[PDB]
Amino acid sequence: MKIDILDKGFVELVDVMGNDLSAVRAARVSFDDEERDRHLIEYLMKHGHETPFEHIVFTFHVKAPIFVARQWFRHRIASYNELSGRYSKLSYEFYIPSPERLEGYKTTIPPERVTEKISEIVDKAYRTYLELIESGVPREVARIVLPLNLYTRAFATVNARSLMNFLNLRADSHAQWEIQQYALAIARIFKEKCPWTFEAFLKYAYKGDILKEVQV
Amino acid sequence: MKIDILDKGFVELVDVMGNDLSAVRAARVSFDEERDRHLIEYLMKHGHETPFEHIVFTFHVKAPIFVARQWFRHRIASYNELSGRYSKLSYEFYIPSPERLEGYKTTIPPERVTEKISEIVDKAYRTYLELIESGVPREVARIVLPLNLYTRAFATVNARSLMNFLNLRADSHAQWEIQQYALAIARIFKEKCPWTFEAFLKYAYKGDIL
Amino acid sequence: HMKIDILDKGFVELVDVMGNDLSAVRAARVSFDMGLKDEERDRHLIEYLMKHGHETPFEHIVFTFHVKAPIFVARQWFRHRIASYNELSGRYSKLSYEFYIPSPERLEGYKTTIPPERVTEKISEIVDKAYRTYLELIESGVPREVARIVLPLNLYTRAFATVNARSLMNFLNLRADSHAQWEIQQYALAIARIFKEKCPWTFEAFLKYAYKGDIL
Amino acid sequence: MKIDILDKGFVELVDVMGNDLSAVRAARVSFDMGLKDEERDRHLIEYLMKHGHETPFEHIVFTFHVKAPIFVARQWFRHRIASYNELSGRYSKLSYEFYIPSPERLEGYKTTIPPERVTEKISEIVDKAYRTYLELIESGVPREVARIVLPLNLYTRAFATVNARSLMNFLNLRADSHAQWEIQQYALAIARIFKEKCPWTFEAFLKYAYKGDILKEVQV
Ligand SMILES: Cc1cc2nc3c(=O)[nH]c(=O)nc-3n(C[C@H](O)[C@H](O)[C@H](O)COP(=O)(O)OP(=O)(O)OC[C@H]3O[C@@H](n4cnc5c(N)ncnc54)[C@H](O)[C@@H]3O)c2cc1C
Ligand SMILES: Cc1cc2nc3c(=O)[nH]c(=O)nc-3n(C[C@H](O)[C@H](O)[C@H](O)COP(=O)(O)OP(=O)(O)OC[C@H]3O[C@@H](n4cnc5c(N)ncnc54)[C@H](O)[C@@H]3O)c2cc1C
Ligand SMILES: Cc1cc2nc3c(=O)[nH]c(=O)nc-3n(C[C@H](O)[C@H](O)[C@H](O)COP(=O)(O)OP(=O)(O)OC[C@H]3O[C@@H](n4cnc5c(N)ncnc54)[C@H](O)[C@@H]3O)c2cc1C
Ligand SMILES: Cc1cc2nc3c(=O)[nH]c(=O)nc-3n(C[C@H](O)[C@H](O)[C@H](O)COP(=O)(O)OP(=O)(O)OC[C@H]3O[C@@H](n4cnc5c(N)ncnc54)[C@H](O)[C@@H]3O)c2cc1C
Ligand SMILES: O=c1ccn([C@H]2C[C@H](O)[C@@H](COP(=O)(O)O)O2)c(=O)[nH]1
Ligand SMILES: O=c1ccn([C@H]2C[C@H](O)[C@@H](COP(=O)(O)O)O2)c(=O)[nH]1
Ligand SMILES: O=c1ccn([C@H]2C[C@H](O)[C@@H](COP(=O)(O)O)O2)c(=O)[nH]1
Numbered sequence: 076m077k078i079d080i081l082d083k084g085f086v087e088l089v090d091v092m093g094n095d096l097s098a099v100r101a102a103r104v105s106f107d108d109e110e111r112d113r114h115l116i117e118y119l120m121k122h123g124h125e126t127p128f129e130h131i132v133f134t135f136h137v138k139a140p141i142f143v144a145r146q147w148f149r150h151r152i153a154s155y156n157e158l159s160g161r162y163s164k165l166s167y168e169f170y171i172p173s174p175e176r177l178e179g180y181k182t183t184i185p186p187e188r189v190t191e192k193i194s195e196i197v198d199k200a201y202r203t204y205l206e207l208i209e210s211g212v213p214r215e216v217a218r219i220v221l222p223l224n225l226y227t228r229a230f231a232t233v234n235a236r237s238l239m240n241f242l243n244l245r246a247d248s249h250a251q252w253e254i255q256q257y258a259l260a261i262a263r264i265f266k267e268k269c270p271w272t273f274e275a276f277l278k279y280a281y282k283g284d285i286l287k288e289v290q291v
Numbered sequence: 292m293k294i295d296i297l298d299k300g301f302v303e304l305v306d307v308m309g310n311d312l313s314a315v316r317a318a319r320v321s322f323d324e325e326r327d328r329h330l331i332e333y334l335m336k337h338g339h340e341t342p343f344e345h346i347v348f349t350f351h352v353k354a355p356i357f358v359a360r361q362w363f364r365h366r367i368a369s370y371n372e373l374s375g376r377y378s379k380l381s382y383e384f385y386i387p388s389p390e391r392l393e394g395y396k397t398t399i400p401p402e403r404v405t406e407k408i409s410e411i412v413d414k415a416y417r418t419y420l421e422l423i424e425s426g427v428p429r430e431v432a433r434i435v436l437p438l439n440l441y442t443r444a445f446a447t448v449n450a451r452s453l454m455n456f457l458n459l460r461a462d463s464h465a466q467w468e469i470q471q472y473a474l475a476i477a478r479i480f481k482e483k484c485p486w487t488f489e490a491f492l493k494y495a496y497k498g499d500i501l
Numbered sequence: 502h503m504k505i506d507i508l509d510k511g512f513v514e515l516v517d518v519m520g521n522d523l524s525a526v527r528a529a530r531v532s533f534d535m536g537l538k539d540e541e542r543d544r545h546l547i548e549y550l551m552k553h554g555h556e557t558p559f560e561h562i563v564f565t566f567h568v569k570a571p572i573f574v575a576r577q578w579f580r581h582r583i584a585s586y587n588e589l590s591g592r593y594s595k596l597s598y599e600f601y602i603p604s605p606e607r608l609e610g611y612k613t614t615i616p617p618e619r620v621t622e623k624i625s626e627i628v629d630k631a632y633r634t635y636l637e638l639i640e641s642g643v644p645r646e647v648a649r650i651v652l653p654l655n656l657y658t659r660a661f662a663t664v665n666a667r668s669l670m671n672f673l674n675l676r677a678d679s680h681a682q683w684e685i686q687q688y689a690l691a692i693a694r695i696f697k698e699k700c701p702w703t704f705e706a707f708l709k710y711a712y713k714g715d716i717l
Numbered sequence: 718m719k720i721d722i723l724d725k726g727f728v729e730l731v732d733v734m735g736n737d738l739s740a741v742r743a744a745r746v747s748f749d750m751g752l753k754d755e756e757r758d759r760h761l762i763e764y765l766m767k768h769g770h771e772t773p774f775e776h777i778v779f780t781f782h783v784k785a786p787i788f789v790a791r792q793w794f795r796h797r798i799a800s801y802n803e804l805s806g807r808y809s810k811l812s813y814e815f816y817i818p819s820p821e822r823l824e825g826y827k828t829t830i831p832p833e834r835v836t837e838k839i840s841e842i843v844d845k846a847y848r849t850y851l852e853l854i855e856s857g858v859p860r861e862v863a864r865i866v867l868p869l870n871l872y873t874r875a876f877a878t879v880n881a882r883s884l885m886n887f888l889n890l891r892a893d894s895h896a897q898w899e900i901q902q903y904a905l906a907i908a909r910i911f912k913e914k915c916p917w918t919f920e921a922f923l924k925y926a927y928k929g930d931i932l933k934e935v936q937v
């Protein structure tokens with residue numbers, strides 16, 4: 076299960092422990108009834124009893140630009156392992172906005188030129204980086220010229236409670252657009268694996284705007 | 292997978308996400324046994340603990356309250372416990388064996404200590420029942436139940452925090468009763484993540500009993 | 502320096518505090534590249550943050566409390582994980598003869614076949630018998646960690662609790678509420694009152710825009 | 718106290734709650750005791766640190782104001798047991814401020830072009846990137862997009878509230894040769910303020926608990 080985001084990004088589901096019933100079992104404290112189980116999901120969610128959802132956990136492999144990643148990693152109730160720029164020589168991959176991204180703003184140049192200007196500095200910066208590498212500058216110093224739209228990759232392990240908080244904050248029109256796109260992809264996977272929690276979430280607890288407008 | 296502890300306790304495995312290779316993927320960030328075990332042993336000797344956060348367990352635990360109060364002090368974890376405010380509580384209490392007092396020289400036989408603990412349990416629970424029956428709400432009436440009352444909780448914990456738990460509780464400074472629970476967590480941990488557990492013991496484990 | 506007595510023998514005492522309402526104003530304003538301004542503008546900002554659920558800034562206000570409470574209240578309380586605790590150890594201390602004996606008024610609303618005073622009395626009896634067994638086992642050489650297991654949940658414990666304002670507001674949402682047990686609500690009202698004294702602007706805003714409970 | 722780091726960075730102490738005795742006090746509640754004596758209390762600290770009792774140190778808390786290159790901020794903010802508020806490039810027009818390494822930053826590395834050329838080549842892309850950034854803003858491009866061309870050595874600012882235990886974990890990990898040299902420098906300043914505010918805790922830490930290398934060789 077892998078969803079493309081932006082121009083070269085993606086959200087990929089690596090693993091999952093549990094399903095809707097894991098939250099139910101934890102709430103009841105019972106190891107071993109659709110309508111009743113689902114009623115309980117709804118009740119916990121409606122009255123703010125969120126601890127049982129911590130028993131559902133996801134691992135994602137995410138590929139995203141550093142400026143998105145830095146917003147993402149502010150979410151502390153989660154586990155992250157990221158590609159190190161200190162030790163790995165970095166790939167020529169950068170997020171270059173679509174002209175589509177600026178259509179809607181009154182600019183004094185065509186958005187094609189915005190794109191071309193962004194692409195131009197990315198190219199010079201990267202070339203400078205490679206010159207420094209070849210000349211023997213250690214990577215951890217050479218990379219500091221790389222712009223914030225460099226794509227990085229991370230594994231993120233997070234429980235459903237923390238994922239829902241993530242959704243309230245990032246699946247929302249006040250969040251930067253680029254991260255909204257990643258949150259839609261998190262939402263899709265979450266919906267597929269925990270359909271009851273997800274619907275109860277949207278109905279009772281979700282505080283954002285986009286997921287009630289935009290299917291899955 | 293279920294391991295009985297003390298007189299009426301247990302630890303069972305409810306679910307697990309991942310295995311030794313979940314740490315290996317994370318540390319490499321992508322997606323040969325001897326290379327991969329070597330990476331596990333390398334992370335462990337150098338204190339690179341974050342990759343082990345991606346293996347997660349859920350256990351179902353039956354434990355007396357005084358053990359559970361020490362256990363729940365481990366904050367990097369998720370718990371749901373049965374509510375005494377709402378469940379009529381079950382005539383289940385930890386009564387030590389006589390062997391629990393080995394090494395101690397006591398005024399009365401260990402067998403009389405045992406008997407005295409169970410007398411109190413009996414009189415406490417009966418007072419509790421007296422109060423329920425007379426219309427005292429449960430949340431009030433159970434305040435007289437002793438600290439050896441058995442409780443049950445689900446516990447979800449990643450392998451890093453599980454290793455910290457074992458460092459502190461699978462050790463002879465912990466109270467013996469919680470050591471016994473820690474031994475069981477260790478045994479389940481070993482079954483599910485052998486390379487990680489083996490490297491843990493050899494390189495990072497700080498306790499003595501394991 | 503603040504001390505509030507709760508129940509028959511408990512208390513909540515403020516030991517120390519870091520920061521004040523302006524500590525959250527300061528933390529927030531760094532976002533816009535700004536700092537402190539005037540009384541009207543900073544007040545308005547604190548209200549703004551609370552309405553919109555920008556809670557991170559309030560993490561920069563921290564309290565240390567010294568609390569005396571029955572073990573059944575302390576157990577509920579220590580479930581709040583985003584905090585730091587150090588408690589009295591039944592493994593190493595000779596425990597004192599102090600137990601919460603509910604007053605007869607605690608039973609108001611409930612028709613009991615035993616009058617209230619006699620309930621109070623039965624609770625005293627059972628507690629006294631437990632403590633005497635406890636003492637007798639200690640005196641006879643039973644290790645303290647073992648002898649204490651006969652002591653009832655209404656035994657008083659003591660603890661230091663360090664908690665930031667954000668996590669404190671979360672504690673107030675859950676415990677300063679009529680769905681919480683009467684005994685912990687009384688502790689929550691003490692906590693709220695100290696919070697009020699020390700962070701009047703944050704507290705007023707919390708109450709108006711974010712507080713989810715009923716009793717405050 | 719404000720300590721300058723790198724060419725333009727700093728660590729400044731905004732606030733502190735508690736001191737060494739805050740930990741002695743929290744620790745003494747286990748044994749039904751309070752504060753006992755101004756040399757028994759120093760021994761209690763050493764003792765706690767010697768046997769791995771870390772929780773008492775949670776009751777000392779610091780708030781720091783830090784200015785640091787993004788690449789450093791990103792490493793720092795990986796410490797989850799802490800509270801952070803950072804200057805936002807979504808909502809602010811960022812200032813012309815970048816970490817340009819000194820020529821001495823490349824001591825002990827054989828290079829092919831001299832260290833002043835390296836230093837120059839970094840400035841060049843920084844000046845090109847900032848101009849572009851300003852051109853994009855001038856043209857009506859929103860800040861949250863324009864800033865994506867700015868390099869990792871752009872300076873940012875944050876508040877960090879952190880307890881002494883977490884701060885001691887930070888020091889284990891960042892006041893250490895394995896950590897990137899730039900964040901080492903930040904960890905030294907943090908060490909310095911911690912020592913000035915909590916000398917007993919700090920000395921006990923270096924002696925019994927600290928796992929890094931640098932703070933045993935580098936004074937303060
Ligand atoms: C033999 C022994 C006797 C003890 N006696 C006492 C006693 O007298 N009094 C008492 O109160 N408790 C005592 N305990 C409890 C002990 O101090 C801890 O509460 C418990 O072991 C949890 O440890 P922890 O904080 O490492 O685990 P967790 O709470 O699970 O946290 C795990 C890790 O995360 C980090 N962490 C999490 N939260 C914070 C935070 N807020 N600040 C900084 N770092 C954080 C730490 O690095 C920690 O190692 C005792 C434990 C044992 C084994
Ligand atoms: C009226 C009521 C009845 C209840 N009955 C039960 C019961 O029957 N059984 C039972 O076990 N408990 C019950 N509780 C306890 C309850 O489940 C919580 O433990 C308690 O309210 C602590 O809340 P918290 O987790 O939000 O606070 P903390 O644990 O401090 O967490 C604060 C916030 O941090 C976040 N957080 C912290 N850690 C994690 C994590 N690991 N994953 C995701 N998010 C995290 C959450 O956003 C949370 O709101 C009851 C509580 C109340 C108020
Ligand atoms: C020299 C070195 C090189 C590194 N290179 C890499 C790299 O290649 N890739 C990469 O992604 N990062 C790397 N880092 C970052 C590292 O993986 C950690 O995220 C960071 O150092 C914070 O460490 P911490 O988890 O101890 O701190 P915090 O996240 O503040 O946690 C502090 C303590 O709390 C406990 N704790 C907190 N949260 C959890 C949790 N969710 N589960 C279990 N225990 C918890 C632990 O006991 C820990 O000791 C590097 C760090 C250094 C120092
Ligand atoms: C539109 C928007 C703009 C923002 N702009 C800014 C900016 O200008 N500057 C900036 O620095 N950041 C900003 N952020 C980041 C934001 O401040 C949070 O750090 C981020 O949203 C993560 O939120 P969280 O703390 O709820 O998540 P997590 O850190 O995963 O915490 C999850 C839950 O745990 C609890 N919790 C966890 N740790 C603690 C703790 N140490 N103390 C108390 N409670 C805790 C809380 O209940 C919280 O809901 C922005 C976020 C968004 C969505
Ligand atoms: O929408 C936002 C705005 C800010 N931040 C956090 C991430 C960084 O730590 C810091 C600056 O983010 P930018 O404004 O530079 O994206 O605040 C977010 O997480 N989300
Ligand atoms: O010494 C290091 C190396 C990496 N990281 C973390 C920070 C980022 O989230 C990610 C990659 O950092 P760089 O290696 O790119 O600096 O891992 C550190 O915290 N410290
Ligand atoms: O109102 C409640 C009920 C339960 N619990 C938690 C605390 C204990 O860890 C466990 C059992 O609480 P009692 O219902 O037994 O009080 O569930 C609470 O925090 N509050």
Ligand SMILES: O=c1ccn([C@H]2C[C@H](O)[C@@H](COP(=O)(O)O)O2)c(=O)[nH]1
Pocket residue numbers: 357360361362364464465466588589590591592593
């Ligand atoms: O070995 C211990 C001793 C104490 N505590 C914590 C749990 C309680 O919150 C408090 C007192 O526990 P007892 O000493 O009463 O078991 O300190 C532990 O976690 N482990």
